[PDB]
Write an enzyme that holds these catalytic residues in place. Structure first.
Site: not given
Ligand SMILES: Nc1ncnc2c1ncn2[C@@H]1O[C@H](Cn2cc(CNC(=O)c3cc([N+](=O)[O-])cc(O)c3O)nn2)[C@@H](O)[C@H]1O
Ligand SMILES: [Mg+2]
Length: 214
Positions: A140, A169, A198
Site C-alpha cells: 500500500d 489500489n 476508499e
Molecule cells: N517506499 C516506501 N516505503 C515506505 N513507505 C512508503 C513508501 N512510499 C510511500 N510510503 C508511505 O505510504 C503512505 C501513504 N502513501 C501512499 C502513497 C502511495 N499510495 C497512494 O498514493 C494512494 C493513493 C490513493 N489515491 O490517490 O486515491 C489511494 C490509496 O489507497 C493510496 O494508497 N503515498 N503516501 C505514507 O505514509 C508514505 O510515507
Molecule cells: Mg491504498
C-alpha cells in the site's frame, strides 16, 4: 500548521473507545466519509482484507506503507497470539501518527513500525530483524514500488511457496506493471477482488498474488 493526519487522530481520540480496535476503525471511516477524504484502505476494501487474513491466519505479516495506521489496526486486531506485523513507513510523522493510533487501539504489542523506505529496509529484514520468510505482504505504498519491491522480496529470499501478496489500489490509482507481472508469471497465482476506492464510488480493487516458488 495542522495536518489532516493530525485531525484524523484527534477525531479518533475524541470519539473512539480506548483499547477497542473496531471503534478506532469506525472513527477514521466516519471522519473520512463525512469531513476529509484520506487514503486509508477504508471499510469496503478493509472487509476483503479481513476475509483474506482469516483464511490464512499468517504468523508474520509485512506491510509496505503505514500512513495513519488504519490497515495496520485492521490487520493486527485479527492476528493470533504470538503472530506479528511489521510495517514499513518512510515518513516519521505518519509513523508517529501510526504508533499513537496503534497505542490507542491497544495493539502496540503486536506491531513493529520500521522507520524508512521499503527499498532500504527490505534487504535488512533477515540480517537486522531475523526474518526467515513472510507469510503475507500487504502492499500500500508508492504504486510504482509494487513490482520492484516484489522482485526485491524475491531476491532477498523472503518469499516462500505460499506467501500471500495483497496489493491495494491495483485499479486506482493503479499498478499496471505489477499486475501484468504477477498475472503473467507462473510464480504467482492471482485473484482479483473487485471493490471501490476508499470513501468513494470509483471502482478499485485488491489483487491477491500467491508465490508458487522459483
Ligand atoms: N517506499 C516506501 N516505503 C515506505 N513507505 C512508503 C513508501 N512510499 C510511500 N510510503 C508511505 O505510504 C503512505 C501513504 N502513501 C501512499 C502513497 C502511495 N499510495 C497512494 O498514493 C494512494 C493513493 C490513493 N489515491 O490517490 O486515491 C489511494 C490509496 O489507497 C493510496 O494508497 N503515498 N503516501 C505514507 O505514509 C508514505 O510515507
Ligand atoms: Mg491504498
Amino acid at each position: 500548521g495542522d495536518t489532516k493526519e493530525q485531525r484524523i487522530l484527534r477525531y479518533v481520540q475524541q470519539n473512539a473507545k480506548p483499547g477497542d480496535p473496531q471503534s478506532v476503525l469506525e472513527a477514521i471511516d466516519t471522519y473520512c466519509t463525512q469531513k476529509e477524504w484520506a487514503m486509508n484502505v477504508g471499510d469496503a476494501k478493509g472487509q476483503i482484507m479481513d476475509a483474506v487474513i482469516r483464511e490464512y491466519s499468517p504468523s508474520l505479516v509485512l506491510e509496505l506503507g503505514a500512513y495513519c495506521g488504519y490497515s495496520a489496526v485492521r490487520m493486527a486486531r485479527l492476528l493470533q497470539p504470538g503472530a506479528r506485523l511489521l510495517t514499513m513507513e518512510m515518513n516519521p510523522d505518519y509513523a508517529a501518527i501510526t504508533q499513537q493510533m496503534l497505542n490507542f487501539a491497544g495493539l502496540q504489542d503486536k506491531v513493529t513500525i520500521l522507520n524508512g523506505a521499503s527499498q532500504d529496509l527490505i534487504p535488512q529484514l533477515k540480517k537486522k530483524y531475523d526474518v526467515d520468510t513472510l507469510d503475507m505482504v500487504f502492499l500500500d505504498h508508492w504504486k510504482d514500488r509494487y513490482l520492484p519491491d516484489t522482485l526485491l522480496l524475491e531476491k532477498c529470499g523472503l518469499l516462500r511457496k505460499g506467501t500471500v501478496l495483497l496489493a491495494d489500489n491495483v485499479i486506482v490509482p493503479g499498478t499496471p506493471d505489477f499486475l501484468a507481472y504477477v498475472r503473467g508469471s507462473s510464480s504467482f497465482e492471482c485473484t482479483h477482488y473487485s471493490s471501490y476506492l476508499e470513501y468513494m464510488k470509483v471502482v478499485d480493487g485488491l489483487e491477491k498474488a500467491i508465490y508458487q516458488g522459483p
